[PDB]
Amino acid sequence: QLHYRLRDEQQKSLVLSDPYELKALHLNGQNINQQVIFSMSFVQGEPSNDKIPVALGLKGKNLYLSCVMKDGTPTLQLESVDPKQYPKKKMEKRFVFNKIEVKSKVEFESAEFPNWYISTSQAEHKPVFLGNNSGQDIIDFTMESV
Numbered sequence: 001q002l003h004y005r006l007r008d009e010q011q012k013s014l015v016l017s018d019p020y021e022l023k024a025l026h027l028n029g030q031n032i033n034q035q036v037i038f039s040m041s042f043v044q045g046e047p048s049n050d051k052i053p054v055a056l057g058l059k060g061k062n063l064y065l066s067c068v069m070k071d072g073t074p075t076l077q078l079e080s081v082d083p084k085q086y087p088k089k090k091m092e093k094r095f096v097f098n099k100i101e102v103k104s105k106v107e108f109e110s111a112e113f114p115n116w117y118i119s120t121s122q123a124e125h126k127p128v129f130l131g132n133n134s135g136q137d138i139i140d141f142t143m144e145s146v
Contacts, residue, residue, distance in 0.1 A: 001039045003059055003146040008120040008138045009105060020078045022128040024120040037146050043091045045111060051098035053111060055091045062086060066094045067110040067130055074113040076130040105140035
């Protein structure tokens with residue numbers, strides 16, 4: 001388990017909001033306290049393309065990012081799991097993200113929904129979602145070790 005904070009290409013930071021939701025907003029050096037710290041771990045997965053399979057959890061919690069078909073669209077969620085079994089090496093496919101490094105920036109493609117990435121909007125206060133890299137969508141992030 002490696003720990004990190006994520007920031008989008010536009011320098012928005014990630015925070016947790018009440019309803020089990022992640023939002024990206026503009027935060028300064030002073031408001032760094034509020035950002036979500038993620039726990040990254042390697043998952044048994046497959047073939048390269050410069051991609052490493054990982055699971056993303058919330059540090060100190062039995063909460064992990066997931067992708068499921070909901071309302072006839074691939075959706076990102078935060079799922080609760082049994083704290084005695086998680087994390088594991090062989091993570092169920094829905095928790096699997098293909099980490100891609102592109103010039104110093106990182107991209108997180110869903111292993112369950114190829115071509116679907118962890119995204120942020122241009123506006124502030126919007127939730128982080130599963131996108132197909134459609135206009136305005138932001139899919140590149142910077143990772144900072146904790």
